[PDB]
Design a protein around this ligand. Structure first.
Ligand SMILES: Nc1ncnc2c1ncn2[C@@H]1O[C@H](COP(=O)(O)OP(=O)(O)CP(=O)(O)O)[C@@H](O)[C@H]1O
Length: 276
Protein backbone atom coordinates (compact mmCIF):
# COMPACT_ATOMS: atom_id res chain seq x y z
CA UNK A 1 0.00 0.00 0.00
CA UNK A 2 1.84 3.04 -1.27
CA UNK A 3 0.14 6.45 -1.98
CA UNK A 4 0.01 7.93 -5.49
CA UNK A 5 1.32 11.44 -6.01
CA UNK A 6 0.42 13.54 -9.06
CA UNK A 7 2.69 16.17 -10.71
CA UNK A 8 1.28 19.08 -8.62
CA UNK A 9 1.56 17.41 -5.26
CA UNK A 10 5.36 17.80 -5.72
CA UNK A 11 7.47 20.63 -7.05
CA UNK A 12 10.99 20.04 -8.21
CA UNK A 13 13.91 22.07 -6.94
CA UNK A 14 16.95 20.82 -8.73
CA UNK A 15 18.57 17.69 -10.03
CA UNK A 16 21.16 15.63 -8.07
CA UNK A 17 21.13 12.29 -9.96
CA UNK A 18 23.88 9.62 -9.56
CA UNK A 19 21.23 6.91 -10.06
CA UNK A 20 21.08 3.21 -11.07
CA UNK A 21 17.94 3.43 -13.34
CA UNK A 22 17.34 7.17 -13.99
CA UNK A 23 17.71 10.52 -12.36
CA UNK A 24 17.41 11.79 -8.83
CA UNK A 25 15.88 15.15 -7.98
CA UNK A 26 15.35 17.16 -4.92
CA UNK A 27 11.86 18.59 -4.41
CA UNK A 28 9.11 19.21 -1.92
CA UNK A 29 5.73 17.90 -0.91
CA UNK A 30 3.37 20.81 -1.70
CA UNK A 31 1.15 19.83 1.29
CA UNK A 32 3.87 19.55 4.00
CA UNK A 33 6.81 21.43 2.40
CA UNK A 34 8.51 18.16 3.45
CA UNK A 35 11.80 17.92 1.46
CA UNK A 36 11.79 14.87 -0.77
CA UNK A 37 14.23 13.13 -3.33
CA UNK A 38 12.56 11.71 -6.47
CA UNK A 39 14.03 8.77 -8.32
CA UNK A 40 12.81 8.24 -11.84
CA UNK A 41 12.79 5.18 -14.03
CA UNK A 42 14.27 5.86 -17.54
CA UNK A 43 14.69 2.97 -19.90
CA UNK A 44 16.34 5.05 -22.61
CA UNK A 45 15.64 3.34 -25.77
CA UNK A 46 19.06 3.68 -27.30
CA UNK A 47 21.80 2.64 -25.11
CA UNK A 48 20.51 -0.57 -23.44
CA UNK A 49 19.92 -4.08 -24.73
CA UNK A 50 16.66 -5.93 -23.95
CA UNK A 51 18.34 -7.81 -20.99
CA UNK A 52 19.46 -4.58 -19.36
CA UNK A 53 16.12 -2.81 -19.71
CA UNK A 54 15.17 -4.83 -16.67
CA UNK A 55 16.19 -2.94 -14.42
CA UNK A 56 12.51 -2.39 -14.45
CA UNK A 57 12.66 -5.43 -12.28
CA UNK A 58 14.93 -3.63 -9.82
CA UNK A 59 12.70 -0.50 -9.57
CA UNK A 60 9.74 -2.72 -8.92
CA UNK A 61 11.47 -4.72 -6.21
CA UNK A 62 12.56 -1.54 -4.49
CA UNK A 63 8.98 -0.28 -4.43
CA UNK A 64 7.61 -3.62 -3.14
CA UNK A 65 10.23 -4.00 -0.37
CA UNK A 66 9.96 -0.33 0.80
CA UNK A 67 6.17 -0.43 0.80
CA UNK A 68 6.04 -2.35 4.09
CA UNK A 69 8.99 -0.74 5.89
CA UNK A 70 8.31 2.06 8.34
CA UNK A 71 11.11 2.74 10.85
CA UNK A 72 13.08 5.96 11.76
CA UNK A 73 16.45 4.37 10.69
CA UNK A 74 15.20 3.33 7.18
CA UNK A 75 14.78 5.90 4.39
CA UNK A 76 10.98 6.30 4.03
CA UNK A 77 9.05 5.82 0.77
CA UNK A 78 6.39 8.60 0.66
CA UNK A 79 4.63 7.71 -2.54
CA UNK A 80 4.79 6.69 -6.19
CA UNK A 81 4.43 8.89 -9.30
CA UNK A 82 3.73 7.84 -12.92
CA UNK A 83 4.82 9.13 -16.37
CA UNK A 84 7.54 8.51 -15.77
CA UNK A 85 7.45 5.96 -12.89
CA UNK A 86 9.02 7.63 -9.83
CA UNK A 87 9.74 6.87 -6.16
CA UNK A 88 9.31 9.79 -3.88
CA UNK A 89 11.66 9.26 -0.83
CA UNK A 90 12.39 11.36 2.30
CA UNK A 91 15.36 13.68 1.52
CA UNK A 92 18.27 12.91 3.93
CA UNK A 93 20.35 16.11 4.17
CA UNK A 94 23.94 15.21 5.26
CA UNK A 95 25.15 12.98 2.45
CA UNK A 96 26.33 9.44 3.02
CA UNK A 97 28.59 7.66 5.44
CA UNK A 98 31.20 6.68 2.84
CA UNK A 99 31.83 10.25 1.73
CA UNK A 100 31.81 11.58 5.33
CA UNK A 101 34.46 9.05 6.48
CA UNK A 102 36.72 10.15 3.62
CA UNK A 103 37.22 13.53 5.37
CA UNK A 104 40.21 12.53 7.44
CA UNK A 105 40.95 16.03 8.71
CA UNK A 106 37.67 16.07 10.57
CA UNK A 107 37.26 12.74 12.24
CA UNK A 108 33.76 11.92 13.66
CA UNK A 109 33.80 12.08 17.43
CA UNK A 110 33.41 8.93 19.43
CA UNK A 111 29.94 9.64 20.85
CA UNK A 112 28.66 10.33 17.29
CA UNK A 113 30.34 7.12 15.98
CA UNK A 114 28.32 5.17 18.67
CA UNK A 115 25.11 6.94 17.66
CA UNK A 116 25.74 5.89 14.00
CA UNK A 117 26.56 2.26 15.03
CA UNK A 118 23.33 1.99 17.01
CA UNK A 119 21.09 3.71 14.52
CA UNK A 120 22.12 1.38 11.71
CA UNK A 121 21.83 -1.69 14.09
CA UNK A 122 18.21 -0.60 14.95
CA UNK A 123 17.30 -0.37 11.24
CA UNK A 124 18.72 -3.85 10.50
CA UNK A 125 17.10 -5.24 13.69
CA UNK A 126 13.76 -4.01 12.33
CA UNK A 127 14.43 -5.62 8.96
CA UNK A 128 15.35 -8.98 10.52
CA UNK A 129 12.15 -8.91 12.64
CA UNK A 130 9.91 -8.68 9.54
CA UNK A 131 8.10 -11.94 8.58
CA UNK A 132 9.81 -13.13 6.57
CA UNK A 133 13.03 -11.25 7.33
CA UNK A 134 14.22 -8.65 4.86
CA UNK A 135 17.72 -9.35 3.39
CA UNK A 136 19.15 -6.00 2.05
CA UNK A 137 22.17 -7.70 0.25
CA UNK A 138 23.90 -4.38 -0.47
CA UNK A 139 24.80 -3.01 3.01
CA UNK A 140 27.87 -0.80 2.67
CA UNK A 141 28.82 2.66 3.64
CA UNK A 142 27.59 4.46 0.46
CA UNK A 143 24.08 3.11 1.31
CA UNK A 144 23.99 4.61 4.87
CA UNK A 145 22.51 8.12 4.61
CA UNK A 146 23.28 10.64 7.37
CA UNK A 147 20.34 12.59 8.73
CA UNK A 148 22.51 14.53 11.25
CA UNK A 149 25.89 14.26 12.89
CA UNK A 150 24.74 15.99 16.12
CA UNK A 151 25.05 13.48 18.88
CA UNK A 152 21.69 14.52 20.38
CA UNK A 153 19.71 14.31 17.10
CA UNK A 154 16.55 12.10 17.15
CA UNK A 155 18.01 10.21 14.11
CA UNK A 156 21.59 10.33 12.86
CA UNK A 157 21.72 7.51 10.28
CA UNK A 158 19.31 5.67 7.97
CA UNK A 159 19.60 2.52 5.81
CA UNK A 160 19.00 3.26 2.12
CA UNK A 161 19.03 1.70 -1.32
CA UNK A 162 17.08 -1.72 -1.10
CA UNK A 163 17.24 -2.47 -4.90
CA UNK A 164 18.88 -5.89 -4.41
CA UNK A 165 16.82 -6.83 -1.28
CA UNK A 166 15.03 -10.19 -0.58
CA UNK A 167 12.05 -11.09 1.61
CA UNK A 168 11.28 -14.84 0.98
CA UNK A 169 9.82 -17.77 2.93
CA UNK A 170 12.38 -19.87 0.94
CA UNK A 171 16.21 -20.09 0.80
CA UNK A 172 17.76 -16.99 -0.74
CA UNK A 173 20.63 -17.16 -3.28
CA UNK A 174 22.74 -15.20 -5.84
CA UNK A 175 26.48 -14.27 -6.31
CA UNK A 176 27.31 -10.85 -4.84
CA UNK A 177 30.18 -8.77 -6.31
CA UNK A 178 31.63 -5.96 -4.02
CA UNK A 179 33.38 -8.63 -2.03
CA UNK A 180 34.99 -6.60 0.67
CA UNK A 181 31.50 -5.94 2.14
CA UNK A 182 29.85 -9.27 1.35
CA UNK A 183 29.55 -12.44 3.41
CA UNK A 184 31.75 -15.34 2.22
CA UNK A 185 28.72 -17.58 1.45
CA UNK A 186 27.52 -14.96 -1.02
CA UNK A 187 30.80 -14.45 -2.97
CA UNK A 188 31.80 -18.00 -4.00
CA UNK A 189 28.94 -18.59 -6.39
CA UNK A 190 25.32 -18.09 -7.61
CA UNK A 191 25.07 -21.68 -6.39
CA UNK A 192 24.82 -21.44 -2.59
CA UNK A 193 21.97 -20.47 -0.26
CA UNK A 194 22.08 -17.95 2.54
CA UNK A 195 19.95 -15.74 4.78
CA UNK A 196 19.63 -12.46 6.66
CA UNK A 197 22.88 -13.55 8.36
CA UNK A 198 24.69 -12.27 5.17
CA UNK A 199 23.54 -8.75 6.12
CA UNK A 200 24.86 -9.30 9.72
CA UNK A 201 28.37 -9.88 8.19
CA UNK A 202 28.06 -6.71 6.07
CA UNK A 203 27.04 -4.84 9.27
CA UNK A 204 30.31 -6.00 10.86
CA UNK A 205 32.22 -4.24 8.02
CA UNK A 206 30.10 -1.11 8.56
CA UNK A 207 31.10 -1.18 12.31
CA UNK A 208 34.68 -1.56 11.20
CA UNK A 209 34.62 1.37 8.83
CA UNK A 210 32.95 3.68 11.41
CA UNK A 211 35.44 2.56 14.05
CA UNK A 212 38.55 3.15 11.90
CA UNK A 213 37.41 5.60 9.13
CA UNK A 214 39.06 3.09 6.67
CA UNK A 215 37.65 0.80 3.97
CA UNK A 216 37.25 -2.89 5.02
CA UNK A 217 40.18 -4.97 3.62
CA UNK A 218 42.05 -1.90 2.29
CA UNK A 219 45.06 -3.14 4.30
CA UNK A 220 45.40 -6.13 1.87
CA UNK A 221 46.05 -6.44 -1.83
CA UNK A 222 45.41 -9.71 -3.64
CA UNK A 223 44.19 -10.73 -7.07
CA UNK A 224 40.39 -11.30 -7.08
CA UNK A 225 40.36 -15.19 -6.92
CA UNK A 226 42.99 -15.30 -4.16
CA UNK A 227 41.12 -12.49 -2.21
CA UNK A 228 37.86 -14.45 -2.28
CA UNK A 229 39.55 -17.66 -1.34
CA UNK A 230 41.32 -15.97 1.58
CA UNK A 231 38.02 -14.50 2.92
CA UNK A 232 36.09 -17.79 2.43
CA UNK A 233 38.64 -20.53 3.32
CA UNK A 234 41.35 -18.74 5.35
CA UNK A 235 39.16 -16.52 7.57
CA UNK A 236 40.76 -13.25 6.18
CA UNK A 237 39.26 -10.19 7.93
CA UNK A 238 40.27 -6.59 8.47
CA UNK A 239 42.52 -6.04 11.59
CA UNK A 240 40.56 -4.50 14.50
CA UNK A 241 42.79 -1.90 16.25
CA UNK A 242 44.31 -2.88 19.59
CA UNK A 243 42.51 0.07 21.32
CA UNK A 244 39.02 -1.01 20.27
CA UNK A 245 36.79 -1.43 23.38
CA UNK A 246 36.50 -5.19 24.04
CA UNK A 247 32.67 -5.30 23.78
CA UNK A 248 32.79 -3.68 20.35
CA UNK A 249 35.64 -6.00 19.30
CA UNK A 250 33.52 -9.04 20.29
CA UNK A 251 30.42 -7.78 18.41
CA UNK A 252 32.46 -7.16 15.24
CA UNK A 253 34.24 -10.56 15.44
CA UNK A 254 31.01 -12.48 16.01
CA UNK A 255 29.17 -10.59 13.30
CA UNK A 256 31.79 -11.52 10.63
CA UNK A 257 32.01 -15.21 11.67
CA UNK A 258 32.61 -17.47 8.63
CA UNK A 259 29.76 -19.73 9.98
CA UNK A 260 26.59 -17.67 9.51
CA UNK A 261 24.91 -19.38 12.54
CA UNK A 262 27.48 -17.87 14.84
CA UNK A 263 26.57 -14.28 13.84
CA UNK A 264 24.34 -12.91 16.68
CA UNK A 265 20.68 -11.85 16.55
CA UNK A 266 20.28 -8.03 16.49
CA UNK A 267 18.72 -7.94 19.97
CA UNK A 268 22.15 -9.04 21.28
CA UNK A 269 24.01 -6.58 18.92
CA UNK A 270 21.79 -3.69 20.00
CA UNK A 271 22.20 -4.46 23.71
CA UNK A 272 25.99 -4.72 23.46
CA UNK A 273 26.37 -1.53 21.38
CA UNK A 274 24.14 0.34 23.88
CA UNK A 275 26.64 -0.57 26.67
CA UNK A 276 29.68 1.08 24.97
N1 LIG B 1 16.87 9.93 -0.11
C1 LIG B 1 17.90 10.65 -0.52
N2 LIG B 1 18.28 11.73 0.20
C2 LIG B 1 19.29 12.53 -0.20
N3 LIG B 1 20.00 12.28 -1.30
C3 LIG B 1 19.66 11.17 -2.05
C4 LIG B 1 18.63 10.31 -1.69
N4 LIG B 1 18.54 9.37 -2.63
C5 LIG B 1 19.53 9.55 -3.52
N5 LIG B 1 20.19 10.66 -3.12
C6 LIG B 1 21.34 11.37 -3.78
O1 LIG B 1 21.29 11.08 -5.21
C7 LIG B 1 22.54 10.49 -5.62
C8 LIG B 1 22.13 9.20 -6.35
O2 LIG B 1 21.65 8.24 -5.34
P1 LIG B 1 21.28 6.67 -5.57
O3 LIG B 1 20.18 6.37 -4.60
O4 LIG B 1 21.03 6.49 -7.02
O5 LIG B 1 22.71 5.88 -5.13
P2 LIG B 1 23.67 4.97 -6.15
O6 LIG B 1 22.76 4.23 -7.05
O7 LIG B 1 24.75 5.84 -6.70
C9 LIG B 1 24.47 3.78 -5.01
P3 LIG B 1 26.11 3.18 -5.62
O8 LIG B 1 26.61 4.28 -6.73
O9 LIG B 1 27.13 2.98 -4.55
O10 LIG B 1 25.82 1.79 -6.47
C10 LIG B 1 23.22 10.02 -4.32
O11 LIG B 1 24.65 10.08 -4.49
C11 LIG B 1 22.72 11.00 -3.26
O12 LIG B 1 23.48 12.22 -3.30
Amino acid sequence: RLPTLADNEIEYEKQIGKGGFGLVHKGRLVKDKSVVAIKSLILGDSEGETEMIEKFQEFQREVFIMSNLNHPNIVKLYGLMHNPPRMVMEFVPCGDLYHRLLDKAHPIKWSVKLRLMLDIALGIEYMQNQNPPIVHRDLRSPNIFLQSLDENAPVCAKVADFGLSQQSVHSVSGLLGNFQWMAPETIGAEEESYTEKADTYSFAMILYTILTGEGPFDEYSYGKIKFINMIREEGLRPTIPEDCPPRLRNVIELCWSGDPKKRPHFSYIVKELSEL
